[PDB]
Amino acid sequence: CSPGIWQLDCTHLEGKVILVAVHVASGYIEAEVIPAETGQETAYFLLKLAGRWPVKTVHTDNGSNFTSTTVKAACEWGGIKQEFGPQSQGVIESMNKELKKIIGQVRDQAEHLKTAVQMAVFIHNKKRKGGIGGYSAGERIVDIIATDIQ
Amino acid sequence: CSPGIWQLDCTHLEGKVILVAVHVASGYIEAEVIPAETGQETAYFLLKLAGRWPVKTVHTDNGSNFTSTTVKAACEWGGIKQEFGYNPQSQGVIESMNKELKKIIGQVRDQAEHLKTAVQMAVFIHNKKRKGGIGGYSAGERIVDIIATDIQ
């Protein structure tokens, strides 16, 4: 769908919180282990994401971190519209699961879970699952946004 | 020079350490306050960066964090080449961004509680900023434009 629409949600592993962001139009993802599942940490993650890509709308569940006033402020400052309401919504579920999968496969290649999370994100966005000539998630997002500039 | 070259360096504000990364060919930047100017923190930042954009070469000075083994390993895993320490197309690029970033931070400090948040606001403003505030491309649009064309 729209190039400025993102979906955010939290998953968990080893008793830690993993904040996930997905660019629905491309499948590109960004994720990070955060100290706690709060609005403060969620707001910080979003500001970084927004300063990186054209984040126009973020879809999430009614998680207290996502409905907190601090995240509301961050979205306002960044000009981001919040929404709490084709295979969508389950996309975030699939991505969360897919991420935990890749993390599982590379978990022993790194000391801390946080490092493993970043390696998994790298693998996911760099992965060329389509035949030669196809685009990875990383290439798709830059392609989608570039074409939307002109 | 190429769409895969980045320069990295640390700057300091309020007694804190800000790790800065600049995509030379576009002026696009990413920054973040880190608890300590160590290799572990630097490697983590690089891994995150590498998974988002095409990072093939990283240019830095010889700060202990940048020459560390942990950074060397992250780079090895990521397929990133390293260079420590003239060329008009790179001369003082990171230096200029450290000031530009600091200036923007000074302007939006109040809008934020901690320094960490201010930095991310500064980065947001820098990447979206247009010369004279009218038309042309911002750093954010230049990087995606440069990368997009290279893909073809």
Ligand SMILES: O=C(/C=C(\O)c1nn[nH]n1)c1c[nH]c2ccc(Cl)cc12
């Ligand atoms: O099923 C999910 C997530 C997972 O199954 C999941 N598994 N591992 N990490 N996440 C969901 C993600 N967003 C939602 C909104 C409403 C409802 Cl009822 C469910 C979900």
Ligand SMILES: [Mg+2]
């Ligand atoms: Mg949830």
Ligand SMILES: [Mg+2]
């Ligand atoms: Mg230095």
